[PDB]
């Protein structure tokens, strides 16, 4: 059994700061859980219930680093933290994701790829940030209309950031929708974007999922 405790599946998989421990087992038969949906930053988790089906029984789990914090992001700023995600008393962010923002006042086109050479199915997770107004949008990413494209041999989708005044949730009126896919052995996944990308930092490899 996998012990999550005060955490949930969403918090554990994204690397919610309050779920820093309990990466625990390399295999398990059932998941032990019982928190504002578990997502630090407000948003909509895509196919969350289906993801719980896949992860409820696995045999060869592993958390690895799909895009190192350095080098893998030569341009763009990767230190983004927010009050919503807080470890102890300081601002933080997801352990497995990075908030990409301004670097020297520019947001160059993003294109980075990774080939699953681990002989297992790979679970990659990313996010799409949605600013509340356009001035803040331009303050971070410097593009009025941005795109995020995630493509592999068995997955493809382009994202458009919808910018509108939203009611503050958890002190935040912005949103980050989270999305996940499974990458088959040898398959290649590419992330293309010009803004609003919560870049993947840590991914996962597993079997029976």
């Amino acid at each position, epitope marked *: 059994p996998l012990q999550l405790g005060n955490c949930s599946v969403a918090g554990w998989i994204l690397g919610n700061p309050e779920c820093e421990s309990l990466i625990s087992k390399e295999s398990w038969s059932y998941i032990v859980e019982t928190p504002e949906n578990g997502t630090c930053y407000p948003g909509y988790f895509a196919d969350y219930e289906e993801l719980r089906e896949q992860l409820s029984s696995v045999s060869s789990f592993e958390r690895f680093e799909i895009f190192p914090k350095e080098s893998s992001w030569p341009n763009h*700023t990767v*230190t*983004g*933290v*927010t*009050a919503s995600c807080s470890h102890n008393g300081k*601002s933080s*962010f997801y352990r497995n994701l990075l*908030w990409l*923002t*301004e670097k*020297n*006042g*520019l947001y160059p086109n993003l294109s980075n790829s990774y080939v699953n050479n681990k002989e297992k199915e790979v679970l990659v997770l990313w996010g799409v*940030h*949605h*600013p*509340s*107004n356009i*001035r*803040d*949008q331009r*303050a*971070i990413y*410097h593009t009025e209309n941005a795109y995020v494209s995630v493509v592999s041999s068995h997955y493809s989708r382009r994202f458009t950031p919808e910018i509108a005044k939203r009611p*503050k949730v958890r*002190g*935040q*009126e*912005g949103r980050i929708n989270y999305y996940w896919t499974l990458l088959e052995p040898g398959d290649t996944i590419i992330f293309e974007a010009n803004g609003n990308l919560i870049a993947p930092w840590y991914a996962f490899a597993l079997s029976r999922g």
Partner: antibody
Amino acid sequence: QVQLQESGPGLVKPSGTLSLTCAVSGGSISSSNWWSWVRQPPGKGLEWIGEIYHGGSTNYNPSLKSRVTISVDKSKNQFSLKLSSVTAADTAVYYCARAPPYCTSASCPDDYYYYYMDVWGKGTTVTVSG
Amino acid sequence: SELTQDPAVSVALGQTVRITCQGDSLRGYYASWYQQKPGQAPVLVIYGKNNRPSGIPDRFSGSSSGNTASLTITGAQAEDEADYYCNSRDSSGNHPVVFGGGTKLTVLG
């Protein structure tokens, strides 16, 4: 790193137009920085004048909005200030500084809700006399 | 709209002193602090909440409690005799920048 150098007249006739220039070296004017002006009348404190973005967005001090005009010139990597209808109350030491980018709404990380000015010019004294 | 701070305070050598800054704009953005010695341009001593620039002694520390920002100097020394200004951005209108009146720190002893 970025360094700022002020250029301006030591003296400006009353009711005339004050004009200064701030040169940027070690960095690019076309960045997500707010290039700001500040002044300090003799024996008084600091008074924010205004700020400008490389794109052209301007925000002035409400009290000086009518007689102030901050400009930018990418040709020489500079930005400038213009204060018109000057009086003795405008006699002061004027600075140019660089302020960070910020956000109005709660959509951005914490780094965009600071306000500070880290790089300053050395200051230029401007006296208003006939 | 305006930031208000006491004009003058005194502290004995090696002691600690809290310089308080209060204003209805401190809720929107974090407050910065400067140190200005006579005949010199201001120098930034605190970026945000307790983040200092490179070259600023650990004696300088910042905090915030609602619309109240504070600058604390531990082990106060004669090199610290100067003016101190808090600074933040207004959370309304076109978001003007406002300065506090300044505080003259006298180091006794």
